[PDB]
RNA sequence: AGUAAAUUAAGAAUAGAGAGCUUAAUUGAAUUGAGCAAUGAAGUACGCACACCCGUCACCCUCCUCAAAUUAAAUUAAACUU
């Protein structure tokens, strides 16, 4: 049993910036984050700050 | 331990009727042993006495024995003289 995280791929946007996506589940909530390799720390949740 | 707590929603059943019941969700803890030891099991030893006691005195009836003398009921060797 490999207790080692399964690294996600690194996709590319139309602009060409690198980004990865992953799902998360806590209680009944489910989230789908889309981290970008380069940014200024701007997190937008459901299109809101 | 997503527990307690708190806050919500729905459902069953009714024509209507619960502060009840069932189910779902949200927020979300504190604590978990230097005893003073309660049960249930395991092991361990011992305690108990039955198969779930004696003593005295209480009324009851019976045989038994001795027992004071009394009253008797009755018994028994027979010898001896000419
Ligand atoms: Mg009602």
Contacts of A15 (CB under 8 A, 6+ apart): none
**What resolution in angstrom units was achieved for this structure?**
3.1
- Strand-strand pairing, A18-26 and A29-36: antiparallel
Query: In chain B, which nucleotides are within 7 Å of a protein Cβ?
Result: 2, 25-28
Helix (H, G, I), strand (E, B) or coil at A45: strand
CB of A28 lies under 7 Å from some atom of strand B: yes
CB A19 within 8 A of CB A10: yes
First to last CA, chain A: 40
Spatial distance between the Cα atoms of A37 and A2, rounded to a whole number of angstroms = 27
CB A20 within 8 A of CB A27: no
Copy the structure tokens of residue A18: 């690198």
Q: How was this structure determined?
A: cryo-EM
């Amino acid at each position: 049993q490999s207790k080692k995280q399964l690294i996600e791929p690194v996709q590319y946007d139309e602009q060409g910036m690198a980004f990865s996506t992953s799902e998360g589940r806590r209680k009944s909530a489910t989230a789908q984050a889309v981290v970008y390799e380069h940014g200024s720390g701007k997190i937008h949740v459901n299109g809101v700050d």
